[PDB]
Write a protein that binds this ligand. Structure first.
Ligand SMILES: CO[C@H]1C[C@H](C)Cc2cc(O)cc(c2)NC(=O)/C(C)=C/CC[C@H](C)[C@@H](OC(N)=O)/C(C)=C/[C@H](C)[C@H]1O
Length: 214
């Protein structure tokens, strides 16, 4: 499949550099942000299903699932929420600077906790705390499955997905972790972060653990 390439709005590039280069601790907050996002997407499909219950048939179980892939230095955060169409990915993940982008950068620079990023509506970008590359793989009931991809540089690509597992419906955040952030592949560390910062989640959070049979 041929990829389409898009330039990030300048303010989003600025934001990504600020997060990549300027913040030094409490990097674990990325997980609470991505779980909150996943929870929002699940709320949206649950709400939609109230008056359109057939919307659930593409994936009847509502869940958040976290999968460390230590060989690839990858952490995946999956939800069976509403998902995003190709146009939604292009419009919401880089071409248009959302309300809050500039406000957050100003707040961070004046000394706000990076943990406040979610209150500005740009917490997705907190993944660049631990990752230097990301794929967002998404399946809306209203479109085909698509892959958005960024390498923390100034452009991103969107490509029709003929390479990943079918998700019935929903989204996978595939984070390619930095070498100094591989603690986030460890079962105990993930459980710790979830229990400490994501205590009030309405959906089950599943952790996929790969272990050698002795
Ligand atoms: C297309 O509109 C989306 C919301 C919109 C981008 C505004 C929004 C809503 C949030 O809960 C959090 C937001 C931003 N924070 C963000 O930083 C952004 C820009 C997220 C992109 C969307 C997720 C990849 C995406 O995460 C996911 N797991 O699907 C997400 C939260 C999608 C929403 C369901 C969808 O309604």
């Amino acid at each position: 499949m041929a990829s389409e390439t898009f330039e990030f709005q300048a303010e989003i590039t600025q934001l990504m550099s600020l997060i990549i280069n300027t913040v030094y601790s409490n990097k674990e907050i990325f997980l609470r942000e991505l779980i909150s996002n996943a929870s929002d997407a699940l709320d949206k499909i649950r709400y939609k299903s109230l008056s359109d219950p057939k919307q659930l048939e593409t994936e009847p179980d509502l869940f958040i699932r976290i999968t460390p892939k230590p060989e690839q230095k990858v952490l995946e955060i999956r939800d069976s929420g509403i998902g995003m169409t190709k146009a939604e990915l292009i419009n919401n993940l880089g071409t248009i600077a959302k309300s809050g982008t500039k406000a957050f950068m100003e707040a961070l620079s004046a000394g706000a906790d990076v943990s406040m990023i979610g209150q500005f509506g740009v917490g997705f970008y907190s993944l660049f705390l631990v990752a230097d590359r990301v794929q967002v793989i998404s399946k809306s009931n209203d479109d085909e499955q698509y892959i958005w991809e960024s390498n923390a540089g100034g452009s991103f690509t969107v490509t029709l997905d003929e390479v990943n597992e079918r998700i019935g419906r929903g989204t996978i955040l595939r984070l390619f972790l930095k070498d100094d952030q591989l603690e986030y592949l460890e079962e105990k560390r993930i459980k710790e972060v979830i229990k400490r910062h994501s205590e009030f989640v309405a959906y089950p959070i599943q952790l996929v653990v790969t272990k050698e049979v002795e």
